[PDB]
Amino acid sequence: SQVFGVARIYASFNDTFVHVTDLSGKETIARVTGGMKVKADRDESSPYAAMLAAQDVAAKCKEVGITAVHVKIRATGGTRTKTPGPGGQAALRALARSGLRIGRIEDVTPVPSDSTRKKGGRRGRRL
Amino acid sequence: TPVTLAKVIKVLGRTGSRGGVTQVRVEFLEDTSRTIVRNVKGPVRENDILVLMESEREARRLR
Amino acid sequence: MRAKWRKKRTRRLKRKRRKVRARSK
Amino acid sequence: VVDPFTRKEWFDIKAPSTFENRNVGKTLVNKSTGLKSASDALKGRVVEVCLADLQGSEDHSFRKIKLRVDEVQGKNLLTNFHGMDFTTDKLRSMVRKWQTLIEANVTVKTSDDYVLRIFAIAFTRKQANQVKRHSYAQSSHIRAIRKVISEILTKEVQGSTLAQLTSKLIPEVINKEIENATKDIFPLQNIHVRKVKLLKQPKFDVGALMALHG
Amino acid sequence: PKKRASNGRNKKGRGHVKPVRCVNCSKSIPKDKAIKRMAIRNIVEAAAVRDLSEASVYPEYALPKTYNKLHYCVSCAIHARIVRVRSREDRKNRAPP
RNA sequence: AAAAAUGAUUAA
RNA sequence: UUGACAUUGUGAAGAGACAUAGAGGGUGUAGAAUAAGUGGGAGCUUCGGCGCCAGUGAAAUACCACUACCUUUAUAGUUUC
RNA sequence: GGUGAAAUUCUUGGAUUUAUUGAAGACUAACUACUGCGAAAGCAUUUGCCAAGGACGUUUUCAUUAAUCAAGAACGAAAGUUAGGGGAUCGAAGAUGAUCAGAUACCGUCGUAGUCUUAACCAUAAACUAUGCCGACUAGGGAUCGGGUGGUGUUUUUUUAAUGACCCACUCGGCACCUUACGAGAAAUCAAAGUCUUUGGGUUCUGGGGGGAGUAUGGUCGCAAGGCUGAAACUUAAAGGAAUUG
Numbered sequence A: 001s002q003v004f005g006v007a008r009i010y011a012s013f014n015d016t017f018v019h020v021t022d023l024s025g026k027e028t029i030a031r032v033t034g035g036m037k038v039k040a041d042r043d044e045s046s047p048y049a050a051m052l053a054a055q056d057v058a059a060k061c062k063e064v065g066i067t068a069v070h071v072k073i074r075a076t077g078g079t080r081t082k083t084p085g086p087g088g089q090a091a092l093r094a095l096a097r098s099g100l101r102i103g104r105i106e107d108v109t110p111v112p113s114d115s116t117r118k119k120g121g122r123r124g125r126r127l
Numbered sequence B: 001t002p003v004t005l006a007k008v009i010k011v012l013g014r015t016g017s018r019g020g021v022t023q024v025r026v027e028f029l030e031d032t033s034r035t036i037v038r039n040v041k042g043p044v045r046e047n048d049i050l051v052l053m054e055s056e057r058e059a060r061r062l063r
Numbered sequence C: 001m002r003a004k005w006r007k008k009r010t011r012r013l014k015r016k017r018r019k020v021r022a023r024s025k
Numbered sequence D: 001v002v003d004p005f006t007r008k009e010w011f012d013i014k015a016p017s018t019f020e021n022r023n024v025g026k027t028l029v030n031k032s033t034g035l036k037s038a039s040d041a042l043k044g045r046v047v048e049v050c051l052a053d054l055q056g057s058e059d060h061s062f063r064k065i066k067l068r069v070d071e072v073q074g075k076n077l078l079t080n081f082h083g084m085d086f087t088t089d090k091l092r093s094m095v096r097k098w099q100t101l102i103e104a105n106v107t108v109k110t111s112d113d114y115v116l117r118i119f120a121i122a123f124t125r126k127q128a129n130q131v132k133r134h135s136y137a138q139s140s141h142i143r144a145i146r147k148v149i150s151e152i153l154t155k156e157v158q159g160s161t162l163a164q165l166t167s168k169l170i171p172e173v174i175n176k177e178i179e180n181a182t183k184d185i186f187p188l189q190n191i192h193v194r195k196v197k198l199l200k201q202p203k204f205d206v207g208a209l210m211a212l213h214g
Numbered sequence E: 001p002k003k004r005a006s007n008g009r010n011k012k013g014r015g016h017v018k019p020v021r022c023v024n025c026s027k028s029i030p031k032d033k034a035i036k037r038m039a040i041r042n043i044v045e046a047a048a049v050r051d052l053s054e055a056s057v058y059p060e061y062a063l064p065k066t067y068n069k070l071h072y073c074v075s076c077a078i079h080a081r082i083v084r085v086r087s088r089e090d091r092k093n094r095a096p097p
Numbered sequence F: 001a002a003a004a005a006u007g008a009u010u011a012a
Numbered sequence G: 001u002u003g004a005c006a007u008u009g010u011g012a013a014g015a016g017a018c019a020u021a022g023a024g025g026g027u028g029u030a031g032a033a034u035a036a037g038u039g040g041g042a043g044c045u046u047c048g049g050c051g052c053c054a055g056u057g058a059a060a061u062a063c064c065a066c067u068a069c070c071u072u073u074a075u076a077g078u079u080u081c
Numbered sequence H: 001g002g003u004g005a006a007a008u009u010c011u012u013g014g015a016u017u018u019a020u021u022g023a024a025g026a027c028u029a030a031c032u033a034c035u036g037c038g039a040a041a042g043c044a045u046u047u048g049c050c051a052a053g054g055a056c057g058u059u060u061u062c063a064u065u066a067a068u069c070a071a072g073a074a075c076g077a078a079a080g081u082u083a084g085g086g087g088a089u090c091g092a093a094g095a096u097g098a099u100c101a102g103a104u105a106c107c108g109u110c111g112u113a114g115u116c117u118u119a120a121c122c123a124u125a126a127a128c129u130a131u132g133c134c135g136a137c138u139a140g141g142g143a144u145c146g147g148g149u150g151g152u153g154u155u156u157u158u159u160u161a162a163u164g165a166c167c168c169a170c171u172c173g174g175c176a177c178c179u180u181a182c183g184a185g186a187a188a189u190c191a192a193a194g195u196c197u198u199u200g201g202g203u204u205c206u207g208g209g210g211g212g213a214g215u216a217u218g219g220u221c222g223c224a225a226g227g228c229u230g231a232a233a234c235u236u237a238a239a240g241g242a243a244u245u246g
């Protein structure tokens, strides 16, 4: 009895994308990113910015029809770190807190069978 | 104004660069099944009541 | 000096000695 | 002020009959106008739905299903099987160390021109009262197993076309027969088709879809 | 002198293994030498377990996990205190805990 | 993972 | 090379300009309502309701402002991409 | 986007993020291990074809045909050279934003050559186990890979047959471990680095204080880069190894 959409939480470092779509994913409903809630420019990946974005999607999730959501948590993937960013748990928790119903949580990070030499050179990023 | 009144039930530890912040666990007065970990500046006992301007953030600087 | 950079500097010197002897012969 | 969510028609998503409850979800596109509007923009849509949602049982929590919208009529989107694959967590949990991974792969077509790639995975098993620690296979068992698995997969395809292929794929009986065939070579733990991908499809054939829907 | 009998790696019998990249710095390191760890987590934090369990439509949910294999260069493993440099006799201990 | 260069000669 | 006219006939579907009129505030801080401007200035109405003053701001609020773009809208038509 | 933080960059001419496709080149995750093969360098998607190889089994065959090897050969990572193809990614040079006293460095964003392949060169690496090869003997254990032997053993078939897979006992060969050295060593350590002043199983190569110097010259090879071979004058009281205390 509840309308289902997709969450598609792309929590990288340097930013978090909270981007709700319909079941097919062709159209989008309230793509809000952590960097348009803060102005710190270094807190875009913060859990606070993710929580504000995840409340903004819930605000647009009502009065548009969607009531329950399928969670697709995503890291940067590919040849980058492919571990979720700091804001992923906060975005999902705020979605759960904001009355949106939750089902089918899955990790959809792009994982390669080895391909495409990683950035950084042979000796690494030297700090 | 949505100010949240929370009762501390546990002091997790003394955090901060200089050790000036306390890690505490607080449950809510209106519903005692809404526990959350927060950062407190001043000195705290158990069974003390705090006021939360925003009631949704988890305190970092754990373990 | 690092040994491989002593080696590299010597190789440039031997290049330049070869060219100056090429002017003669 | 535009408010794009004031012009969308709230269509429904209907799965092929080869399942339990046909309800999938809810979908919406845009208003209908001139200049080749969204009557046909609703066609090329793939809806990812979990087979536990399509079969009303928790033991199908993995094995998500791709459905493809084929023909639209009324407030309904008729869909047909477009693919199948495993969830990443199930895959990762199956893949563990001190065991051999066996992967097979076949490009076969059904009775009709539904050419498609069937995958298959297996993992070796420690038999009972085994003091040994790893239980690896001898790489000739691996080739024998991949040969017989390919034979079974091409046996199950090219007869029992896509409707009955799906009706056999859901009860997890293909890999059961694989277990019966391969139990005389090397014992295995997790035998799964793990993926079906559809490569090329023939002319639209409205009648086959309308047979599978309604 | 020689610090470790198995020099710093696990390679006796082949000569060349292959390189992989460190997760932190993307430094090239032989796979047999790289410090490998298996990060298996519940996909939702212990703080959000009760929250999402109450916000879940499906009773008795599975609560999926995330799996990741991490490769570290020696410098990044020490810096992120994964290996934690040991003493002369403690260096020989190969037990995990 | 912010920055941090130098220190004349001899004298168990 | 570019435009126009002629050669030069027959047709349709999305745009878009002219003229009348009704609409319209779109925001960050904050008066007392969600402030798109500049000039004038303390009154008619069953409401003392509002402006004056005193707080409020980058800038006053009643009123005269069919005035100034800007953004929309329904026409008998007339024109173009 | 990216960073400690930023800014170069792109973006209402719709960037980032979605979904459906397509193309291109490279790569072959997880499985992947104190595991395997190869003379070494190296070798990880499936199947087919071609030749090759170790170990094992053997009451098969030859009968010393062998070991190590100046001269002489073959192969030989990466980078690099020439020509064609390819040219996704990453990226010596370079551009450019930071940081800095300066930064023509580290960090960021791009990016030519390269990175891949064919046909040819080159022949060098901390090409390392920094431990030449062949043979015999000397210590106590657990594993593991390949082959073979045996069973008052189990497992899926006929609920009682091979075989496959596990178990136990062995055995040959192999990658290696753990304990202790009885022995050795300057020690670190080493089952060989032992069987060495109680000094001799066979054989090849190399070194003679530190620098000058792997330089000069000659020869030779290379298209070049350079490789191989390789001094002296002069200079100097240490340089160096392992371990101890601070």
Ligand SMILES: [K+]
Binding pocket: none
């Ligand atoms: K020393």
Ligand SMILES: [Mg+2]
Binding pocket: E001
């Ligand atoms: Mg040292």
Ligand SMILES: [Mg+2]
Binding pocket: E015, E016
């Ligand atoms: Mg090597």
Ligand SMILES: [Mg+2]
Binding pocket: none
């Ligand atoms: Mg001094």
Ligand SMILES: [Mg+2]
Binding pocket: none
């Ligand atoms: Mg876009």
Ligand SMILES: [Mg+2]
Binding pocket: H035, H036
């Ligand atoms: Mg193997």
Ligand SMILES: [Mg+2]
Binding pocket: none
């Ligand atoms: Mg040499």
Ligand SMILES: [Mg+2]
Binding pocket: none
């Ligand atoms: Mg040497």
Ligand SMILES: [Mg+2]
Binding pocket: none
């Ligand atoms: Mg030496």
Ligand SMILES: [Mg+2]
Binding pocket: none
């Ligand atoms: Mg000398």
